[PDB]
Design a protein around this ligand. Structure first.
Ligand SMILES: [Mg+2]
Ligand SMILES: [Mg+2]
Ligand SMILES: [Mg+2]
Length: 466
């Protein structure tokens, strides 16, 4: 039975899509420790978003499943008879799920505290983390796109998936020959608009492009949107997420009847403030709950903020250098052998990351016996599940196979890198597997990955739902 499995996986790995590729493929029975399959398990390879497995485990170790994140509003003293304050600070301590609505609610609280006039300036304080926005080896051509959002302790998260440091751009066709309409979303009045896009003839070709040119806070729209085309909506990153948070808060205060006389900018609560008066605050959901949108949808921003939050907890340092050492030490303390690990970020976006399939499987086993095992597993994509908050990045994979509803695994794909690692429950055992592919030059080998996970589900004793 074991020999059949090995031959079938051998055969799957002979696929032409893996031409020139190196593939770490390890399968283990977690009840015994029996190595069911091992090929190039000690080989160092880029994990892409499989890196988040390491990040999430360390976050749960260091911060705890019950950890929550805070945001506050502070003035030098409370408002008095006149209901006045001078300068005002919006202070973020790394909430990756802070919404525009959360800002309105804090603005309401400011007003309820007796503030009627902010006489001075409004500052956005993101000093809980450093101001290093992007990892060294991240590619600047990726910068406009949501997965490459700048990292800040104070950032507005968009939508139910909580994509941080972005605005939603909507482009709507007008009459043929007239410029297309561009709505910048939350960044209206913050980001600059360079709209060069025109409306094309009905039935013409859609060539619309939405950019943020490198080193600018300009949304540049070019090309042609057909008069009969549906509006085009895209998430685009902004420069300095905290300053957008400041702009949005300004508008919320005004909206809530608080007049702001001064300017909006970046700044930290002054050292010489004797006893800051906290006029409003907000507390995020607990980490266990945050893990779900983080891991199901592979949120890069969440991982990096969690890394800087680890640095804060272990060292009082909201930085990648401290956070990344914190991840390694946490993993060691969990029992994971971290010899093959090279940590350059938390998300896996960095091409400077290295793992081995043996290390991933090692982690999968150690996480399984950790007190937080259940919140950890609930965060992972479940193969072929149609509800996006359940299926995640596996929503449209392995449907109508034995893996559907059973395989829990994390994905990770970029140019020349693809990975799938997780668990296979069954009337036999809860198998743990890692598949890491590097070096292929066509599409990512997702079908090869699916084929292994399905064979494993079958080996485990499962059948396709019909
Ligand atoms: Mg706090
Ligand atoms: Mg606005
Ligand atoms: Mg099944």
């Amino acid at each position: 039975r074991l020999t059949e499995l090995r031959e079938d996986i051998d055969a799957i790995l002979e696929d032409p899509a893996l031409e020139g590729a190196v593939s770490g493929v390890v399968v283990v029975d977690t009840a015994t420790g029996e190595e069911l399959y091992s090929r190039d398990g000690g080989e160092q390879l880029l994990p892409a978003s499989n890196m988040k497995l390491f990040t999430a485990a360390a976050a749960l170790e260091v911060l705890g499943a019950d950890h929550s994140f805070g945001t506050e509003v502070a003035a030098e003293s409370a408002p008095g008879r006149r209901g006045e304050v001078q300068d005002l600070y919006l202070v973020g301590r790394g909430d990756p799920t802070l919404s525009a609505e959360d800002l309105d609610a804090m603005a309401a609280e400011v007003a309820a505290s007796g503030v009627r006039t902010v006489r001075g300036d409004l500052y956005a304080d993101d000093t809980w983390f450093d101001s290093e926005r992007l990892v060294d080896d991240w590619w600047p051509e990726d910068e406009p796109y949501a997965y490459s959002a700048q990292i800040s302790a104070l950032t507005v998260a968009h939508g139910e998936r909580f994509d941080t440091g972005v605005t939603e751009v909507s482009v709507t066709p007008a009459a043929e020959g007239e410029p297309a309409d561009v709505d910048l979303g939350a960044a209206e009045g913050y980001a600059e608009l360079d709209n060069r896009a025109v409306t094309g003839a009905a039935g013409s070709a859609n060539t619309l492009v939405i950019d943020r040119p490198v080193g600018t806070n300009t949304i540049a729209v070019t090309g042609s949107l057909p008069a009969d085309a549906a509006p085009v909506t895209a998430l685009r990153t902004v420069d300095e997420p905290a300053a957008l948070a400041g702009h949005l808060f300004e508008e919320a205060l005004e909206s809530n009847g608080v007049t702001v006389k001064g300017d909006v900018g970046l700044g930290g609560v002054p050292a010489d403030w004797q006893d800051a008066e906290v006029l409003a605050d907000h507390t995020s959901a607990e980490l266990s709950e945050i893990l779900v949108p983080f891991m199901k949808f592979s949120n890069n921003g969440h991982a990096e903020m969690l890394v800087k939050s680890i640095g804060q907890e272990t060292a009082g340092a909201g930085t990648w250098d401290a956070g990344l050492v914190g991840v390694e030490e946490a993993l060691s303390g969990l029992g994971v052998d971290t010899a093959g690990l090279v940590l350059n970020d938390g998300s896996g976006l960095s091409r400077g990351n290295l793992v081995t399939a043996d290390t991933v499987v090692d982690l999968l086993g150690q996480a399984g016996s950790a007190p937080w095992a259940q919140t950890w597993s609930a965060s992972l994509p479940v193969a072929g599940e149609s509800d996006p908050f359940v299926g995640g990045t596996l929503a449209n994979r392995m449907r109508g196979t034995a893996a559907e509803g059973v395989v829990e695994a994390k994905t990770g794909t970029m140019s020349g890198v693809s990975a799938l690692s997780g668990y296979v429950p069954g009337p036999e055992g809860e198998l743990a597997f890692s598949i890491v592919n590097n070096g292929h030059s066509g599409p990512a080998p997702l079908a090869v990955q699916d084929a292994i996970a399905v064979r494993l589900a079958e080996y485990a004793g499962h059948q396709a739902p019909e």
